[PDB]
Amino acid sequence: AKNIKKGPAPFYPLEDGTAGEQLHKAMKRYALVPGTIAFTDAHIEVNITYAEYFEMSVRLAEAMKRYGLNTNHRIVVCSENSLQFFMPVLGALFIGVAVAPANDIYNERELLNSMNISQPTVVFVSKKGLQKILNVQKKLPIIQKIIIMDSKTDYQGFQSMYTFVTSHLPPGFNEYDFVPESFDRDKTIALIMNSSLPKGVALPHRTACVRFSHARDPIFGNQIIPDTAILSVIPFHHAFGMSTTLGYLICGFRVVLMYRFEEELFLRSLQDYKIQSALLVPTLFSFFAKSTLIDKYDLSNLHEIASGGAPLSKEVGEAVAKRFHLPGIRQGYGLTETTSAILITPEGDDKPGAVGKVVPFFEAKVVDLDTGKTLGVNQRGELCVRGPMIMSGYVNNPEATNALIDKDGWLHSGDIAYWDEDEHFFIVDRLKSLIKYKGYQVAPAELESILLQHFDAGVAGLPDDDAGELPAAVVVLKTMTEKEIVDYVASQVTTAKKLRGGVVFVDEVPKGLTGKLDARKIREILIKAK
Numbered sequence: 001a002k003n004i005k006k007g008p009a010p011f012y013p014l015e016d017g018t019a020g021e022q023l024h025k026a027m028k029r030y031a032l033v034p035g036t037i038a039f040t041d042a043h044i045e046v047n048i049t050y051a052e053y054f055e056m057s058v059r060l061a062e063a064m065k066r067y068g069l070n071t072n073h074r075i076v077v078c079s080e081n082s083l084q085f086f087m088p089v090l091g092a093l094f095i096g097v098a099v100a101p102a103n104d105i106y107n108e109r110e111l112l113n114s115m116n117i118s119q120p121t122v123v124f125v126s127k128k129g130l131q132k133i134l135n136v137q138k139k140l141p142i143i144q145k146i147i148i149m150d151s152k153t154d155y156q157g158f159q160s161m162y163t164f165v166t167s168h169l170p171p172g173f174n175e176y177d178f179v180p181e182s183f184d185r186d187k188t189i190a191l192i193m194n195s196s197l198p199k200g201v202a203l204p205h206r207t208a209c210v211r212f213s214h215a216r217d218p219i220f221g222n223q224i225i226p227d228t229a230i231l232s233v234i235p236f237h238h239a240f241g242m243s244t245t246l247g248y249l250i251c252g253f254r255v256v257l258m259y260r261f262e263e264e265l266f267l268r269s270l271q272d273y274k275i276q277s278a279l280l281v282p283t284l285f286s287f288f289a290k291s292t293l294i295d296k297y298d299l300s301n302l303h304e305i306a307s308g309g310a311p312l313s314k315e316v317g318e319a320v321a322k323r324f325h326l327p328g329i330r331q332g333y334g335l336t337e338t339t340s341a342i343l344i345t346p347e348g349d350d351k352p353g354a355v356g357k358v359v360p361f362f363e364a365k366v367v368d369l370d371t372g373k374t375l376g377v378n379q380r381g382e383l384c385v386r387g388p389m390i391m392s393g394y395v396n397n398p399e400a401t402n403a404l405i406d407k408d409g410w411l412h413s414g415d416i417a418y419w420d421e422d423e424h425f426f427i428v429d430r431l432k433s434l435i436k437y438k439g440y441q442v443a444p445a446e447l448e449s450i451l452l453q454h455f456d457a458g459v460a461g462l463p464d465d466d467a468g469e470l471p472a473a474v475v476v477l478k479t480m481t482e483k484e485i486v487d488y489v490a491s492q493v494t495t496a497k498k499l500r501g502g503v504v505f506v507d508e509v510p511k512g513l514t515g516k517l518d519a520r521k522i523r524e525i526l527i528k529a530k
């Protein structure tokens with residue numbers, strides 16, 4: 001148990017009450033300070049204050065309570081990042097209604113699969129997504145009501161959130177006398193998120209409360225300080241975006257949002273909102289690996305860039321940190337099933353390449369794939385974590401649940417990792433993404449992070465008769481041909497991790513979610529081509 005990595009005591013303590021109660025308390029305090037901005041749409045340059053956000057969320061909460069939504073119900077929220085997004089989230093948390101964010105770029109099949117699991121009584125949806133909701137709806141009689149989020153009037157026959165609250169809110173309603181519901185926070189679901197074919201990740205209120213400790217933690221999150229502005233290009237429906245933003249709201253920060261990344265706007269927004277901290281995913285670290293515009297703008301307020309969701313190249317990360325004049329890139333490692341990051345780069349405890357250290361209340365260990373024994377320092381194995389932020393289980397799928405989490409409460413991440421003498425953790429890859437040329441493992445990240453100098457590519461395992469797999473790549477180019485690339489690699493690495501059967505040229509590398517690589521799509525581009 002010298003081989004169990006334990007998070008320290010928190011620097012900001014766990015708070016009583018439901019996630020809702022805590023979000024209510026914080027945002028009521030912030031609402032009472034004039035001019036405090038909750039969100040900012042960088043695109044249309046519009047702000048919404050904590051006072052506004054608070055009142056509308058509360059109205060929405062009460063409106064829902066009167067409509068009959070109780071702890072036994074579920075709503076989905078289906079939208080791109082927007083000013084309205086968190087209104088029905090907050091409303092639903094205040095009164096103990098589970099929120100099921102659904103990915104706003106699902107096709108209809110993916111969308112139907114999700115909602116078929118979350119079984120929502122009410123659907124909050126953006127104009128951009130209404131149509132897809134309408135198509136899948138016939139196969140989901142559970143849905144009783146559709147409500148448009150980003151319109152003020154009724155829209156195509158459906159009530160807006162504003163016409164909806166109108167319908168049920170008394171005229172004698174005072175928001176500041178509203179009291180959030182109280183209930184058991186271990187037993188009551190705050191969130192149902194997707195991970196993916198798809199599963200519903202159920203997250204008790206308690207996991208969010210724990211998140212709010214981390215979020216407010218000055219060492220593992222951000223210290224509450226007035227006039228803090230953050231720029232986030234993370235999808236609010238993903239655990240990354242949902243858990244950071246809710247954290248930022250508990251912290252009274254200004255969340256500057258964007259529903260789509262664009263290099264110029266991003267950069268100008270950092271400058272003009274005096275952004276102290278920006279959230280990215282590694283996929284975007286290319287745009288600053290090319291740079292050019294970044295030195296125009298004034299980024300002298302930026303203290304921090306945080307990445308998560310996918311492996312960040314060590315060189316790329318070091319490289320991009322320099323260009324923003326930052327000591328390093330802050331990192332967070334998490335799973336939808338752990339609610340948020342459980343490995344985080346602690347302030348003033350860096351290490352290039354590491355994803356950080358065990359968060360407060362948590363424990364981590366690396367285990368042997370064959371016997372499950374706990375491994376020691378620098379020993380690669382499967383990353384396991386346990387703590388009060390781990391989901392209560394998959395929705396209506398107890399088999400997958402027991403498959404993921406054991407008696408001792410250890411979650412098996414499917415990631416290969418190790419920790420060093422300083423208790424820093426390093427992610428190697430998904431166990432599934434590793435390639436075995438003889439009996440010898442090859443990690444994709446290792447071959448990708450030697451290609452990036454010669455634009456962008458994705459290494460995968462080209463199956464075989466008698467080797468099992470052969471390291472292969474899928475690449476995005478002014479000119480250099482296959483044999484010239486294979487031979488280039490063969491001059492760079494050792495015997496067994498050569499591209500012994502690689503290279504296929506493509507438009508763009510099949511990336512997904514929060515800038516992660518599709519092992520599948522790449523491993524079929526290659527199989528199709530041979």
Ligand SMILES: Nc1ncnc2c1ncn2[C@@H]1O[C@H](COS(=O)(=O)NC(=O)c2csc(-c3nc4ccc(O)cc4s3)n2)[C@@H](O)[C@H]1O
Nearest residue numbers: 239240306308309310311332333334335336339340341427
């Ligand atoms: N930092 C990382 N480095 C390398 N790989 C990473 C990674 N994070 C996720 N991954 C990969 O994503 C998989 C899970 O994807 S997932 O299930 O969609 N969920 C996630 O990726 C996920 C859920 S919560 C979360 C984060 N929360 C944060 C809070 C603050 C902060 O500063 C940084 C972060 S990242 N990420 C993991 O198994 C792993 O393979």
